């Protein structure tokens, strides 16, 4: 279909909670090679968040069963591996789209931080399931997040939802992947305090996402403490 038809199909699939269809529409939109609008970017992000999210959720459950009867333990292991392969293919699809189209065509700082945060996120999902390839995957997630972090602190306001969201996920990466709960706490606390200090920079079109992420930043700080 043409771009506008694929975007409309994606919004329909979203409403229908058919996230595989939504992801296929937005993947096709991305493969046309033109720079994504903010709307298209959010549709792509939401679609794949749900596609990979179902696998991460299934993986956690089956891994927990596999850990907690010889025959039944072998089956759990084989099923986890099946889920992991799906999870891997999804992450690689997203990471290939980011490197072939999204990151090279991001002309504005807002877009570059969004896509580098996304790269940080999908290598973090690989790291969650990776057990000697792990270090390299962890380093790829850390490098994408660090570059996005540097650009956000320089080019964006401390209340911008993309800057706050990235600080929330890099903070989650430090806690969950690198087992550094003190710098996870410092990263989330500074992000929160620097937003509180400049609330006059809130936009009417983005204040709801901004204030939501601040609440999430403080929840993680309170839970990790």
């Amino acid at each position: 279909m043409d771009k506008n038809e694929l975007v409309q199909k994606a919004k329909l699939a979203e409403q229908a909670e058919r996230y595989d269809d939504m992801a296929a529409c937005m993947k096709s939109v991305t493969e046309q090679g033109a720079e994504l609008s903010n709307e298209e970017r959010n549709l792509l992000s939401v679609a794949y968040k749900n596609v990979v999210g179902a696998r991460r959720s299934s993986w956690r459950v089956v891994s927990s069963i596999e850990q907690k009867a010889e025959k039944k333990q072998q089956m759990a292991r084989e099923y986890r591996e099946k889920i992991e392969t799906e999870l891997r293919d999804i992450c690689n699809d997203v990471l290939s789209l980011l490197e072939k189209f999204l990151i090279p065509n991001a002309s504005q700082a807002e877009s570059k931080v969004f896509y580098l945060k996304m790269k940080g996120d999908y290598y973090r999902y690989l790291a969650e399931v990776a057990a000697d390839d792990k270090k390299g995957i962890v380093d790829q997630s850390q490098q994408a997040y660090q570059e996005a972090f540097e650009i956000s602190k320089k080019e964006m306001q401390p209340t911008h939802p993309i800057r706050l969201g990235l600080a929330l996920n890099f903070s989650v990466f430090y806690y969950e992947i690198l087992n550094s709960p003190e710098k996870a706490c410092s990263l989330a606390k500074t992000a929160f305090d620097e937003a509180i200090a400049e609330l006059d920079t809130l936009s009417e079109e983005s204040y709801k996402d901004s204030t939501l992420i601040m609440q999430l930043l403080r929840d993680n700080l309170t839970l990790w403490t």
Binding site: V46, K49, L168, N169, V172, Y175, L212, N220
Partner: peptide, 5 residues
């Protein structure tokens, strides 16, 4: 630990 989105 919750992330965003």
């Amino acid at each position: 630990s919750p992330s965003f989105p």
